[PDB]
Design a protein around this ligand. Structure first.
Ligand code: NE8
Ligand code: NE8
Ligand code: ZN
Ligand code: ZN
Lengths: 356, 356
C-alpha cells in the first residue's frame, strides 16, 4: 500500500464513496472514526486523544512504550488531533501555553511541537495545528483567527516535512477555518491548497451553531476544497448531521456523541435516540435496535435497562458497543447506497424513520 | 441429563474434584460461581442476586420477562441466594420485614416467599432461607440463630417440594450455621441431613473472622456434611482462601472480590494482587498476568493502567474480565491437580509464588 492514496469509486450529487489507502490499512469513506479508548479493538481508523495523551502519560512516554499502535493494540490507521482545540491559557503567534490541571506542569503547544507530539504518538493521519475560532465570532476576529491558523498551517507543513519517518509514512491534513463567513472560508481554502495537504478538514464547526447553520456553511465551504482529496468534518455529529454532511461532500467524521451517550443512558436506533434508563424499557424484550446486527442486539432493552439502573459497568459497556456499532452500520449503509446510486432515497427513508 | 447428580472423579486428602450434572448443564467442581451481571456471557454456573432482583425489577416481573435465563441470555445453570443474608429490618419466627430504599415499598421475606421468589427467577440451584449469624456471636445467640435457621430449612424444603416444576427441575441446598462453635455446627449438620438436601452450604463464614478462624471452622465443619453431596462455602474468597478451602473439602465458591476489585483497580495475578493504578505500572509492558490466557493478557499493564487512570469504562471492564478469568484459571488448575494427584504440590507452589 502507498503512504496515502484517496480514490473515489462512486458519486451521487455532492456525496462520494471511496477508499483511502495507507500503509497500515484501507479506510472506507464516508468513514466514522471512533475514540480508540471507547471499546475493545467495523471501524477502519481510530482516534488518539492528543491533548489527553500529552498530559497522561506524555508523548515521550508513549513513544518509549512503542507508540500508540503498540500501546493500544491497534495496528490499523490512527488519526490524532493537533491539540490546540482541546487546550483552548495564554495564546500568541508562537502557540499556546497552559498549565496541566493534573499536576501543575507547564506545557507549550506550537505548530512545531504539535507535529512532534503526533510524530511521537505514531499516528498515521496528523492534523495541522490550528486555532478553533469560538462561536459566534465577528468578521474581524474570525479573519484574524483564520489568518493565524493559515500561518500555523504552513509551519505545520514544514515541521511535518522535516521528519523523514513522518513525511514518508504518515499523512498531513490541513484545517479550514473562517467561522460562518463565506469569504474567509474561501481565503482559508485557497491558503491551504497553495500549501498542499493530503486531506482537508472543515474546522470551526460543531461549536454550538446548530444544524441549519452548519449545513449552510458546508453548502459553500466544501466545494472550495480540492475535490480529489478527502474532506473531514471535525466533531460531527448526530446521525442526521452525518447524513446531511455526506450529502454535502464530507468523507470523514468524528464525534464524542456515541461514547458520551453510551455513558449517560442514550442509545442510537434507526427510530431515533432512546434513553434506556426510562421506565418504559423495563419490560421491553426487543433488542436495542430491531435491525441492528451488533452483538448486543443477544440482549434485550429490558436487560440493558436493568444493568444501567443497577450501576453495573457491563451496562454502560454494552450501550457504548451498540452505539459505536450503530454508527458503523450507518456508515456502511451510506457507502452502499452511494455506490448503488440510491443514497438520496436512503437519506429520505432514514430521516422519515429516525424522526418519526 | 438428570435433575441433579454429583459424582466425585478424584480425591487427594480432603479435596475432591468431580461434576454436578443438571438439566441445563454440567458444573465442574471445585467450581467458582461468578456474579452473572459481571461481564458478557470458563464458568459453568452464574449467580443471580435475589435481594437486588426482588427490589428491581421484582421477581414477578422477571418471571413475566421469561425468567433469569432468558433475561440474562444465559442458558446454563444459575444459583440464587435466599435473600435474607443480604437483607439483614424486623425479624421474627415468620421471616424478615424491611423497607426498600429504592421506593419505600414494604417487603416480607419468609422461607416460603424466598423459595417462591427463586422459583419465579427460574434458578437451578435454590438456597434454603437462613439467618446468617453475625460475627462474633455468643454461644447462646449462635444457638438460637442456628436453631431458627434449621426450622426455616425444613420450611424451605417443604415449600420447594410443593412446586412441582421446581421440585422436578431445580435443586435445593441447605445451609449449615452455628457460628464458630463445633457443637452447634454438628447439630446443624445433623438437622440438615435429616431433612435431606441436594447439596450443603457452609454458611455464616466470610463475615469478618479472618482466614485462620475460617480454616479452623472448616476443619471440623466440612466432615460433618454428607460426603457424597457438594459442599458450598458461601462468600469465599481470596484465591488463597479458595485453595485452603478446597484442601478442606469445599466444592463450590462465590465471592464479591473479583468484581469489586475489578472496579477499584485491583487485579489478581499468580504473583499476588496488584493495584494497577499505581504509578509503577505506567510503563509496564507485561500483560496483567504473565501466564494468564485471558483475552486481556493483548493488553499491557501500562495500557490498562492508563485506561483506569483516565476514567475509561473499558479499563474497569478489562480488569473485571481478567479477574473473573483468573479465578476460573485457578479453579481449572485446582481441578486438574486434584485429578492428577498433585494438588498438595500445586497448593505449596501457588502459595510460595502468590505470597512472594
Ligand atoms: N483541530 C481542531 N479540532 C476540532 C475538533 C476536535 C476534533 C478531534 C479529532 C481527533 C481527536 C479528538 C478531537 C472539534 N470537535 C468539534 N468541533 C471541532 C472543531 C475542531 C477544529 O476546528 N480544529
Ligand atoms: N444465605 C446466605 N448467604 C451468605 C452469603 C451470600 C452468598 C450469595 C450467594 C449467591 C448470590 C449472592 C450471595 C455470604 N457472603 C459471604 N458470607 C456469606 C454467608 C452467607 C450465609 O450464611 N447465608
Ligand atoms: Zn446493536
Ligand atoms: Zn488475564
Amino acid at each position: 500500500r502507498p503512504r496515502f492514496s484517496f480514490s473515489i469509486a462512486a458519486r451521487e450529487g455532492k456525496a462520494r464513496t471511496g477508499t483511502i489507502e495507507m500503509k497500515r490499512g484501507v479506510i472506507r469513506t464516508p468513514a466514522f472514526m471512533p475514540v480508540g479508548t471507547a471499546a475493545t479493538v467495523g471501524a477502519d481508523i481510530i482516534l488518539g486523544n492528543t491533548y489527553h495523551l500529552m498530559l497522561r502519560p506524555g508523548a515521550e512516554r508513549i513513544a518509549k512504550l512503542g507508540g500508540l499502535h503498540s500501546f493500544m493494540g491497534w495496528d490499523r490507521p490512527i488519526l490524532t488531533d493537533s491539540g490546540g482545540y482541546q487546550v483552548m491559557t495564554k495564546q500568541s503567534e508562537e502557540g499556546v501555553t497552559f498549565k496541566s490541571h493534573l499536576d501543575g506542569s507547564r506545557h507549550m503547544l506550537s505548530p512545531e511541537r504539535s507535529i512532534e507530539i503526533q510524530h511521537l504518538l505514531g499516528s498515521d493521519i496528523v492534523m495541522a495545528f490550528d486555532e478553533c475560532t469560538p462561536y459566534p465570532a465577528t468578521p474581524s476576529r474570525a479573519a484574524s483567527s483564520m489568518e493565524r491558523s493559515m500561518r500555523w498551517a504552513k509551519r505545520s507543513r514544514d515541521a511535518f516535512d522535516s521528519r523523514k519517518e513522518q513525511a514518508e509514512n504518515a499523512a498531513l491534513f490541513g484545517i479550514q477555518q473562517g467561522s460562518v463567513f463565506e469569504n474567509l472560508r474561501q481565503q482559508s481554502a485557497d491558503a491551504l491548497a497553495e500549501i498542499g495537504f493530503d486531506g482537508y478538514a472543515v474546522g470551526g464547526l460543531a461549536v454550538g451553531e446548530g444544524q441549519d447553520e452548519m449545513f449552510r456553511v458546508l453548502d459553500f465551504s466544501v466545494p472550495m476544497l480540492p475535490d480529489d482529496k478527502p474532506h473531514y468534518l471535525m466533531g460531527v455529529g448526530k446521525p442526521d448531521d452525518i447524513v446531511g454532511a455526506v450529502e454535502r461532500g464530507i468523507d470523514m467524521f468524528d464525534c464524542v456523541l456515541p461514547t458520551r451517550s453510551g455513558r449517560n443512558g442514550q442509545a442510537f436506533t434507526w427510530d431515533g435516540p432512546i434513553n434506556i434508563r426510562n421506565a418504559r424499557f423495563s419490560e421491553d424484550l426487543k433488542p436495542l435496535d430491531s435491525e441492528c446486527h451488533c452483538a448486543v442486539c443477544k440482549w434485550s432493552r429490558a436487560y440493558i435497562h436493568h444493568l444501567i439502573r443497577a450501576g453495573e459497568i457491563l451496562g454502560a459497556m454494552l450501550m457504548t458497543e451498540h452505539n459505536i456499532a450503530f454508527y458503523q452500520q450507518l456508515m456502511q449503509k451510506i457507502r452502499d447506497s452511494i455506490s448503488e446510486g440510491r443514497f438520496s432515497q436512503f437519506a429520505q427513508d432514514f430521516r422519515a424513520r429516525y424522526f418519526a
